[PDB]
Amino acid sequence: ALENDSIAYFDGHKDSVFAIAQHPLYPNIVATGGSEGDADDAPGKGYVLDISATSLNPIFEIDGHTDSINALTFTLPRGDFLVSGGMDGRMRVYAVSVPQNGALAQFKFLAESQETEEINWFAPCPSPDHPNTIALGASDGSVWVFTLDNPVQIVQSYFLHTGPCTAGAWSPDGLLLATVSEDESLHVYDVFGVAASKSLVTDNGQTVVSLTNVDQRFAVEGGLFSVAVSPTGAVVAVGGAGGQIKIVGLPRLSQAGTILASLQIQSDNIESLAFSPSAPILAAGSTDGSIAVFDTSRSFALRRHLRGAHAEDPVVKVEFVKSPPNAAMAGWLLTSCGMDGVVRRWDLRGGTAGPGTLPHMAPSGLVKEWKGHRSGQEGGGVLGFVQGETGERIVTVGDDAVVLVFEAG
Numbered sequence: 017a018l019e020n021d022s023i024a025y026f027d028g029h030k031d032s033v034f035a036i037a038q039h040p041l042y043p044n045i046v047a048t049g050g051s052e053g054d055a056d057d058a059p060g061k062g063y064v065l066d067i068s069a070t071s072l073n074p075i076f077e078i079d080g081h082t083d084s085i086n087a088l089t090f091t092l093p094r095g096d097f098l099v100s101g102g103m104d105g106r107m108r109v110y111a112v113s114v115p116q117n118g119a120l121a122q123f124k125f126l127a128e129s130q131e132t133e134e135i136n137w138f139a140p141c142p143s144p145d146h147p148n149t150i151a152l153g154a155s156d157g158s159v160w161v162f163t164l165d166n167p168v169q170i171v172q173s174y175f176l177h178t179g180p181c182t183a184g185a186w187s188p189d190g191l192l193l194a195t196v197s198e199d200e201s202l203h204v205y206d207v208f209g210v211a212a213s214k215s216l217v218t219d220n221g222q223t224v225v226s227l228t229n230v231d232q233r234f235a236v237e238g239g240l241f242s243v244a245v246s247p248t249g250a251v252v253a254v255g256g257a258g259g260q261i262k263i264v265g266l267p268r269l270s271q272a273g274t275i276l277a278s279l280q281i282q283s284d285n286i287e288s289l290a291f292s293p294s295a296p297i298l299a300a301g302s303t304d305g306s307i308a309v310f311d312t313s314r315s316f317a318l319r320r321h322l323r324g325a326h327a328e329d330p331v332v333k334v335e336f337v338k339s340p341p342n343a344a345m346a347g348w349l350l351t352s353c354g355m356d357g358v359v360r361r362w363d364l365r366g367g368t369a370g371p372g373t374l375p376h377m378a379p380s381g382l383v384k385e386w387k388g389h390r391s392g393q394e395g396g397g398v399l400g401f402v403q404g405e406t407g408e409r410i411v412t413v414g415d416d417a418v419v420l421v422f423e424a425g
Contacts, residue, residue, distance in 0.1 A: 020388040024421035026072040033413035036400045037088035039095040043404035044068045049085030060085040076123045089138040091148040101135035126167045143190025153181030176203045182241050187249040194252045196240035200229040216267045225273045233275045236260045244289035255286025277316040281308045288334045294347030301331030311373045320367030322379035326354025337407035355397035357389035386422040389414040
């Protein structure tokens with residue numbers, strides 16, 4: 017008799033659902049992908065759902081993965097493609113057509129490739145200058161940038177990390193790509209060569225910032241697991257073992273590699289980092305169950321330490337609502353999910369603020385929670401979510417092989 021706040025669900029996955037992606041123009045279109053079983057020959061499987069529809073029927077199926085789907089993304093700016101990335105290293109590219117008569121979206125397979133042996137993440141490039149460009153990071157530490165137009169061309173392939181590449185994030189202008197590794201390194205790639213023409217690259221010609229375990233003010237023993245770039249592109253934050261966060265300077269493209277701040281409020285891996293798009297704050301989710309919030313214009317002074325945000329289960333993902341219905345809350349509303357099987361939303365306006373960081377206004381500031389997934393101890397936990405522009409509909413993917421739809425309103 018678990019509480020269940022879902023307004024819809026999808027139970028077509030046979031095992032853990034690792035990945036979710038939302039169409040950038042049509043938030044009702046969502047793709048989910050994961051594992052079909054734990055037997056070592058179990059294949060991967062993906063679905064596309066239309067959430068405008070209690071038990072959802074998919075409008076498309078992603079087949080061809082011989083191992084778990086680890087990553088999914090629609091391309092920016094308009095979702096012309098859908099890409100899936102597997103534990104098998106397979107990258108499958110689909111053309112996406114969304115008829116203007118309101119009929120079902122169509123998906124056509126274009127090509128499969130296998131540049132790496134295992135894909136850890138995708139990130140679409142936000143540059144308006146380079147549409148339909150995507151980056152991925154792999155288990156061999158390599159980072160690949162592709163452009164889709166054989167629709168696939170290679171923009172770059174990087175081999176600087178020596179251990180698994182755990183996360184990547186683009187700068188807002190989409191000219192820089194920051195990636196981190198278990199081997200404790202951070203590299204920020206000059207993907208389209210702009211920084212090099214301005215004489216802003218390191219001696220390896222490829223990055224604007226390269227920091228490794230030999231850099232003593234930087235090295236995070238145990239590795240890095242998360243990365244985020246500030247809305248101005250001025251700094252990158254990296255999160256790692258033992259609750260450590262490092263703030264590093266980026267060059268202005270329109271100084272670099274300096275450690276501007278080191279943070280260690282939390283006690284275990286920083287798995288998720290997010291800069292607020294419009295408030296001077298940085299949120300960090302930890303494996304220890306807490307979320308911490310820092311004031312970016314006050315040397316990252318601590319604003320609030322939300323202990324037990326997800327009890328003592330890992331905080332898996334934090335993400336700011338881009339355009340909440342209450343415009344006064346823009347930049348201050350945070351959504352999080354955890355291995356406790358719960359999704360939560362937080363009002364971050366409170367805490368210890370200071371000059372320039374006041375709003376024009378179990379832990380505090382909880383606005384709402386959504387239950388339905390099993391908890392981690394019962395084979396559940398929320399592995400990811402999307403929430404569109406307004407945060408009014410939340411779609412989750414769970415370790416318990418379920419996809420749930422929640423509503424905020």
